[PDB]
Amino acid sequence: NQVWNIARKELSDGLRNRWLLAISLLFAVLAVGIAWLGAAAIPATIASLASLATFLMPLIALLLAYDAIVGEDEGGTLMLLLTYPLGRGQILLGKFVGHGLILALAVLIGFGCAALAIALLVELGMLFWAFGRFMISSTLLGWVFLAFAYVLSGKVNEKSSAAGLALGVWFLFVLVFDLVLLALLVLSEGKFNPELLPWLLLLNPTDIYRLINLSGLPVPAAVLWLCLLAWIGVSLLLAYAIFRRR
């Protein structure tokens, strides 16, 4: 299967990416240094780790895959690859597997060394369930912004404006959408029902990421897992629909 044959490239190309390994080291240092100041200075420190992985796991995913499609179009290999026995779906889905297992490994070095810094500086029956819920949901947050990066790469025609949109999606989905949620609270009260606001949190995958790190809320947990996976499944379907229109 060539969905794996193009996935083995992106592992080998991602592990020699100098930009990724700098940030993934910085992700693992900040995950111990928050955990050092949460034990020496727990659900109170796993919430501060959730604010860290809401900053960086969208940033790691957008650093990997903002030049996934349009970086191959600028390199000319994309027009070459379509002449191979390859659909346009298998290029995208295989890059999603290849870029997906990088940040599925970058949280295993990120939080795999953070769980080592808690297990040697403190309960471990609660640790492997609160971090199993943390590492899985941090990968699924990263796979949304991976699929967001494939959407913006397929729309743009140049690599320089791809980073201009990947920064734009990162600003909008991390810290502009919640600032306009507060501005809809503190500046609008006659036309803003605040009971509706626990339901508008499902329109933001960074927000659904924190909600499955804050339980340990009108909706249950199982819809919240299926609302994070729906952000993958719609945006990958959006990325496949956009990639077929090049």
């Binding site: 060539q2 044959n5 193009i6 083995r8 490239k9 080998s12 190309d13 020699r16 990416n17 390199g75 000319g76 290999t77 027009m79 070459l80 690859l81 379509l82 002449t83 191979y84 026995p85 390859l86 659909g87």
Partner: protein, 298 residues
């Protein structure tokens, strides 16, 4: 017949960049697409690859549809310029394409020895030159006995030993039964290896056929040169009576342009009187036929 392109007219939206080309590529011949820099040489290959949609025309590649993966297993293609993946290494990127095309990984290494990039193998693609990438870009197209090549300028930035070694690699593939399409700009030299040139203008395919057909159809002068002739100035007369402009650059070098229809009697004039130190009876080249056919369409 390998490629049967009939009546196809590809448009970039409104602007019809190609128009009414009726191209037929036999199963063992080697076609040469030549033209301007905007004559549609690169886009005409995209019609063969099936990646670009044949608006108001049908393309029959190998008796099948041009976007089938069943025929893309035997369709190697080298694009114009491919800075492939500069963080990958040169051997590994060819291993990457071999897994994609269904080629065996044991076919990878001796392709580097065949193309001559074995010494710079296992080195990063950013460490490669322009010509070194062209050897690598050729190498992926040769993977797993492709019935149809498509080369768009394989000889750019490439040494004249290696380009001459490239055409021998092409002529090896001609004997195995694989049609090749060249889209070049190094028109002197390539005429020994192609079978049918396919000089095209902006939209329309101008002329096709072998070089024997083009020189028979397009009337071009033979460029004779009598270098180191004994006398030149009364030898100005010896071709004007036969209807040829006896232009002479140096003191004893007449580059006369004759008819190539009375070659024996004009050369019996040249071999009978006037001494032949070094003679260049030069046939009308592909470049002259290129020069004739581009202006004739304008």
């Amino acid at each position: 017949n390998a490629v049967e392109i009939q009546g196809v007219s590809q448009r970039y939206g409104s602007m019809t960049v190609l128009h009414d080309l009726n191209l037929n590529l036999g199963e063992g011949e080697v076609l040469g697409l030549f033209g301007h820099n905007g004559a549609g040489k690169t886009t005409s290959m995209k019609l063969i690859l099936g990646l670009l949609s044949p608006s108001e025309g049908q393309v029959k590649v190998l008796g099948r549809a041009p976007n089938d993966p069943q025929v893309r297993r035997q369709l190697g293609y080298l694009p114009e310029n491919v800075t492939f993946y500069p963080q990958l290494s040169g051997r590994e990127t060819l291993r990457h394409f071999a897994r994609l095309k269904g080629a065996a990984l044991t076919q990878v290494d001796e392709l580097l020895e065949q193309v001559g990039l074995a010494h710079a193998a296992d080195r990063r693609v950013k460490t490669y030159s322009k010509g070194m990438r062209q050897r690598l870009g050729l190498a992926q197209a040769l993977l797993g006995e492709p019935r149809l090549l498509l080369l768009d300028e394989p000889t750019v930035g490439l040494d004249p030993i290696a380009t001459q070694d490239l055409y021998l690699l092409i002529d090896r593939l001609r004997q195995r039964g694989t049609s090749i399409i060249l889209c070049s700009h190094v028109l002197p030299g390539v005429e020994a290896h192609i079978n049918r040139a396919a000089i095209l203008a902006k939209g329309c395919l101008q002329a096709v056929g072998s070089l024997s057909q083009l020189r028979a159809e397009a009337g071009l002068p033979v460029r004779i040169r009598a270098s180191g002739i004994s006398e030149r100035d009364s030898w100005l007369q010896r071709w004007t009576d036969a209807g040829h402009s006896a232009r002479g650059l140096s003191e004893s070098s007449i580059e006369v342009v004759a008819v190539n229809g009375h070659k024996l009697v004009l050369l019996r004039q040249l071999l009978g009187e006037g001494e032949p130190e070094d003679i260049e009876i030069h046939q009308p080249s592909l470049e002259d036929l290129y020069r004739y056919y581009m202006e004739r369409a304008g």
